[PDB]
Write a protein that binds this ligand. Structure first.
Ligand SMILES: CN(C)Cc1ccccc1Sc1ccc(O)cc1O
Ligand SMILES: CN(C)Cc1ccccc1Sc1ccc(O)cc1O
Ligand SMILES: [Mg+2]
Lengths: 210, 210
């Protein structure tokens, strides 16, 4: 079963703004997704402080960056707290309606798109570079699910019978045809060093067979 | 009953660093505390999206800044999710052990104290300006508690029979004798505009009788 949901009007508006506004500084999408991963890792760490069994689904707390030039995908994997099905449907665990409001009011007051993460909706900066985003997630309290959207007002949720993850979130960015620089090792390294050099979890940039 | 707890060695180390390092840019303490309040407000908002009764303890989501020159206190009040007794004992709901580690490693790599909030331990920047901090908190799942510390390696927790808060957190900064500029209306306004101008909750700066 694939279930299809409509985005709330404000989130649809946010994604259309991200897709259609001319804005050259697209590289901040990776900082925002790594920041979300770090937040998710913080959350499972915090829960584990009083219930160590929370880590039975995986003790390692890390972020992996996986480019694939054949599929034209960049995948960000974390072993953080993950998302339940209900979290996925609630705009990926965000307060996206109120966050979008505050982001829009800030843009009116002289903010720019790079400040999106201050308003809790940094995930949607993925659409600066991706035509489609697939999110695979596993939370301790639910089964493994796949969320997907190519924007256009709707997203799908289905149970994921793919590779079991144990716990965490994978964001698969199906890149736009003119955004393949974000598959290049030196480009990813540059962005991580520029924007994410002090993240408190190991970030491993995977290599590809040439 | 007043219970006294020792800080973990790493947190005690962090507070001693904050208290003893020469660092003139102390004003960032307010940005960090407002940011924590905004995070707590985001959390109760998110919970309320699927269980509206979470707001039975108070529908208003806001931040108040209350200077008191007679007591020499600056109080930051929020109606966010609040903290249970267990949260208070776990370093105010932070991952302070791992966060302190990452903050220290960043300081070695060219970070400065103003970046403390990136590592989840921004609360402790309160000790840039306060000799003592009192935290009154009420979470939906627990009773109202008061946490207190003048650093020096220990903190206390007691049930609070003061004014019932409903839900949220009050951080009371008992300011150092040479830090009373942070009670001045124009100074607080300047800092809020400089560092917190896009927070998505109303921030109300209370006035005093002269
Ligand atoms: C809402 N929670 C239950 C989970 C959660 C909380 C904070 C941050 C991330 C997350 S999950 C996640 C979402 C987006 C992403 O890009 C990476 C992630 O790890
Ligand atoms: C751990 N949670 C259960 C609560 C919580 C989560 C995130 C941020 C703040 C908080 S509570 C709080 C702590 C410090 C402060 O300065 C202001 C606050 O509102
Ligand atoms: Mg944050």
């Amino acid at each position: 079963e694939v279930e299809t949901f409509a985005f709330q009007a404000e989130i649809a508006q946010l994604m259309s703004l991200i897709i259609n506004t001319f804005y050259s500084n697209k590289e901040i999408f990776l900082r925002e997704l790594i920041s979300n991963s770090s937040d998710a890792l913080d959350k499972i760490r915090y829960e584990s402080l009083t219930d160590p069994s929370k880590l039975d689904s995986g003790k390692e707390l890390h972020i992996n960056l996986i480019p694939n030039k054949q599929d034209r995908t960049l995948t960000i994997v974390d072993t953080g707290i993950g998302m339940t099905k209900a979290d996925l449907i609630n705009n990926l665990g965000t307060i996206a309606k109120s966050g979008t409001k505050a982001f829009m009011e800030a843009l009116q007051a002289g903010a720019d798109i790079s400040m999106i993460g201050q308003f809790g909706v940094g995930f949607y900066s993925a659409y600066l570079v991706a035509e489609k985003v697939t999110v695979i997630t596993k939370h301790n309290d639910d089964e493994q699910y796949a969320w997907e959207s190519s924007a256009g007002g709707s997203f799908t949720v289905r149970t994921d019978t793919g590779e079991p993850m144990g716990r965490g979130t994978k964001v698969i960015l199906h890149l736009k045809e003119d955004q393949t620089e974000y598959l290049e090792e030196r480009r990813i390294k540059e962005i991580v060093k520029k924007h994410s050099q002090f993240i408190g979890y190991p970030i491993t940039l995977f290599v590809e067979k040439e």
